[PDB]
Structure of Calpain small subunit 1:
Amino acid sequence: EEVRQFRRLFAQLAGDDMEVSATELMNILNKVVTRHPDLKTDGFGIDTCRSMVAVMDSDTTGKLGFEEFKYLWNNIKRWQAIYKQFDTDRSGTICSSELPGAFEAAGFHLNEHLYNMIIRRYSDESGNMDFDNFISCLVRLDAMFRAFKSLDKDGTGQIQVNIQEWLQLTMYS
Amino acid sequence: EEVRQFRRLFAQLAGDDMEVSATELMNILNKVVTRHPDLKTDGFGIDTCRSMVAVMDSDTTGKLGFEEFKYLWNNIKRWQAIYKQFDTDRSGTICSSELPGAFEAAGFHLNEHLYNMIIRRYSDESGNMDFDNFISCLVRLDAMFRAFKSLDKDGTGQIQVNIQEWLQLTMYS
Ligand SMILES: O=C(O)/C(S)=C\c1ccc(Cl)cc1
Ligand SMILES: O=C(O)/C(S)=C\c1ccc(Cl)cc1
Ligand SMILES: [Ca+2]
Ligand SMILES: [Ca+2]
Ligand SMILES: [Ca+2]
Ligand SMILES: [Ca+2]
Ligand SMILES: [Ca+2]
Ligand SMILES: [Ca+2]
Ligand SMILES: [Ca+2]
Ligand SMILES: [Ca+2]
């Protein structure tokens, strides 16, 4: 009864409006990381969770319905496993050297330039990335892959994006 | 002596590497808003300030040099004055009703669907937006418009990108 127990997880987490808000997501995540001492974090901030919710909120209800949440949560579960696997010095954080292997293992094969860009945006002055920043980066990276894929109808490797779609994809995220 | 003084602030804030990090930006932003009770805020969070740095970091030092900082700073001061001006309610926050005047006065004219996304992503359940969310929203919007315009010089309203570029545009940010 796994999908049962997951259905229970969602229902109790979503509460009275049956959708998962930025705050409810923030709270469950902080609650869960608390039990994983191998994962260092300063915590999931509200801003970060609003951004994770918008980027998963396919129907734009402001909040995460069952499928949108299930997709997010199944990814976080695989990604968490990967972070542990690739923290091979047990700093509880992913440094620049560990990051490629980790992201590849989640199925994003980026080049050097991009790996650097990501380190610049999401890692600290030491080149170290803690767990909330890794999850947040990955959720967005995956959404941006998926959004490109949707727009490349013809499979040319190029998308045309109008300003309305651009603003929608960049501001609601 | 507006120039002298602004160069002196910059120097003292930027410290020994002569650039403003996300953390230095965070601290001066929270220091400043304290002396402005009318700008209601739960504080500028480090996440929000890394995003602010990233979107303004044109030379990709990972940090804001003098010009990059001055440019961000001057927008913040302008938008800050717009925030009070359009908080005609004087609640210290911007509600869904005051929002479009504020954005119109920052020169952004957006359709209703975009407004709804932005209210959803930046405002609380009362439809109120506080100062750090506001500034964070506009620094992002302004950047996203400058990104797109930069790539669509002759106002076709469309850009064409491959995945590398799209990831640069949407993840560095
Ligand atoms: O947290 C859980 O209850 C489950 S079943 C998997 C899991 C482990 C770690 C994180 Cl951060 C999220 C989910
Ligand atoms: O910070 C300043 O020196 C001035 S003049 C205006 C101002 C007020 C609030 C913020 Cl957050 C930034 C600038
Ligand atoms: Ca709920
Ligand atoms: Ca939704
Ligand atoms: Ca490590
Ligand atoms: Ca963090
Ligand atoms: Ca500095
Ligand atoms: Ca810079
Ligand atoms: Ca108001
Ligand atoms: Ca806020």
